[PDB]
Design a protein around this ligand. Structure first.
Ligand SMILES: CCOP(=O)(O)Cc1ccc(C)cc1
Ligand SMILES: CCOP(=O)(O)Cc1ccc(C)cc1
Ligand SMILES: [Zn+2]
Ligand SMILES: [Zn+2]
Ligand SMILES: [Zn+2]
Ligand SMILES: [Zn+2]
Lengths: 335, 335
């Protein structure tokens, strides 16, 4: 009970590699902000309504074959690990929680040094989140174009926490700006092995030069938003820029491109779904649920059959959906 | 137990006007960020260390004559009303908690409409903060120069919540940019009476044209940071720009200027002290405590005697420190 060791931390305790099964590596129960669900639960109808909706969605994902999700909600996404543990137990789906910082850190984080941030990320991996004793199994970081000075520190702190514990790093990018190239430079400057990093939102680009430049160095490629656009604060007239300019089939075909290039063991697929979403326009969930009623079951019910139709084998899809997440999540300095 | 009515809400329940006594109207137990004390209590040594330090400081303030403080920490300052109630009971000092939003709201707040924000502020005044049942007795808002679009909505929502409940509004300004002039315009556009508003950090300027333009319309003037600079994110080489360019005597003399102009009933004085401070550089509390060891007792131990030495009567100082805060805090549409 003291030490990361080799099992994977979930919000209901450690699991073996063989228990993870079919794993969605980039998901959210709720996309929110620190403190917001505790301060304003009625925003979501109620906490009970959100919890019940998440249990129904995870039971639908489980019926389609999902056994684990990685909830990549950080502190500043409003991660509530008590809600994750309740939903995990009710749905009988393992949930891996995250540490790290996304793109909305408050001043009490933004003023911290790289050493202080490393202490905070290590707290959440090695000791517990808040007073719950629940430990993170992944470290989430973010850029949106060139890193801000503080995001460079977050990247470096995530590398240090990974180098101490063997827990991997998952990134948010603006893939259209090729952020993974700067993220890789910063991680490598700290000595992190690329096999401990997934460069996320990588389905937000069709640039195979960018994607293969990352995979060739050993990074995992997170094709993690297949049923929806790589969304961002476009201001002006954003709202339901949800679906995106590109079809889900176009994003899914990147999975086949990377298989065809030899990178089957470096692909991680997901929906980047959520059951509540306060860090966006009001009623965004009506739009999301009308467009993708399968929610987190979209990957197994629609993307897997589509790839089979395109000639990808069941064995190759099991490597992507079962073997890769287990190898990636199992703590190590080199996977 | 349902309804604002006429008593003042504190973190230990309603008090009468006569129970408030000598009141500091702009203070903080902790200056932080939402969720931060729960997620990283070791930043402050521990939660117990911060709590004990706050109890010692409030007992020193009580020994100097203070009976109530108004903790103007919002959601995004990391207000923890359970910590306030614990400290209040241990120190035997009443604490009035705040709703509203300061200058660090997260995306889940910044994307909300004026109606949604009003619902949130009314929740915290009329129902309770989080699941505590503790109700706010004041609404805190902020600008730093020209209002952002979202800060205009916060100002308007604060006015609407005040117009429904009679709870007053307290503002953060960059006084050097005369923000209170735009804040007054926005409040008045919603129908709020100026007697329900204190324009804070007004000791951050020597501009008597600005200060009297506000007082002449009926606003209260918050001379609320006497022992320290009106601090802000100056970046570059901020850190210990704590003391400021102006002396505490220069700020205190604004109190006498406004008395001499006829505005004794519109002055509110405070320290704007805190016992922990994570929304600033590390170890800022060492600097603060070395420079002002009297903490929240600075007003009664140093500013009151200084004003007496300058010819202000004990009766005039009781109006400022006892009568004005009771009249201001007691819920009403017109004070
Ligand atoms: C909840 C975090 O979700 P995400 O996967 O980064 C998608 C996302 C949500 C909200 C904003 C402002 C940008 C992007
Ligand atoms: C805790 C809120 O305190 P304040 O009175 O506005 C003084 C203040 C603190 C922190 C920053 C970044 C600006 C100003
Ligand atoms: Zn993201
Ligand atoms: Zn996400
Ligand atoms: Zn302020
Ligand atoms: Zn303050």
């Amino acid at each position: 009970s003291i030490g990361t060791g080799d099992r994977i931390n979930t919000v209901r305790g450690p699991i073996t590699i063989s228990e993870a099964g079919f794993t969605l590596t980039h998901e959210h129960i709720v996309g929110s902000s620190a403190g917001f669900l505790r301060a304003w639960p009625e925003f979501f109808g109620s906490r009970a309504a959100l919890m019940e909706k998440a249990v129904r969605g995870l039971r639908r994902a489980r019926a389609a074959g999902v056994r684990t999700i990685v909830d990549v909600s950080t502190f500043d996404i409003g991660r509530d690990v008590s809600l994750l543990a309740e939903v995990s137990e009710a749905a009988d789906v393992h949930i891996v929680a995250a540490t790290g910082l996304w793109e909305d850190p408050p001043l009490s984080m933004r003023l911290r040094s790289v050493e202080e941030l490393t202490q905070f990320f290590l707290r959440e991996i090695q000791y517990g989140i808040e007073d719950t004793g629940i430990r993170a199994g992944i470290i989430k970081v973010a850029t949106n174009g060139k890193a801000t000075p503080f995001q460079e520190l977050v990247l470096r702190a995530a590398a240090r926490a990974s180098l101490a514990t063997g827990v991997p790093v998952t990134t948010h990018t603006d893939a259209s700006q090729r952020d993974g190239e700067q993220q890789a430079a910063i991680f490598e400057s700290e000595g992190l092995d690329p096999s401990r990093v997934v460069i996320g939102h990588s389905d937000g680009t069709d640039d195979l030069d960018y994607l293969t430049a990352l995979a060739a160095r050993g990074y995992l490629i997170g094709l993690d938003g297949i049923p929806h656009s790589a969304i961002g604060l476009e201001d002006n007239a954003s709202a339901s820029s949800w679906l995106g300019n590109r079809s889900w089939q176009t994003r899914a075909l990147l999975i086949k491109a990377l298989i065809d290039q030899g990178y089957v063991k470096q692909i991680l697929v997901s929906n980047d779904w959520l059951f509540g979403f306060s860090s966006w326009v009001t009623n965004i969930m009506d739009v999301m649920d009308s467009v993708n009623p399968d929610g987190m079951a979209f990957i197994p019910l629609r993307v897997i059959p589509f790839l089979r139709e395109k000639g990808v084998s069941q064995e190759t899809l099991a490597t992507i959906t079962v073997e890769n997440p287990a190898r990636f999540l199992s703590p190590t300095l080199r996977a």
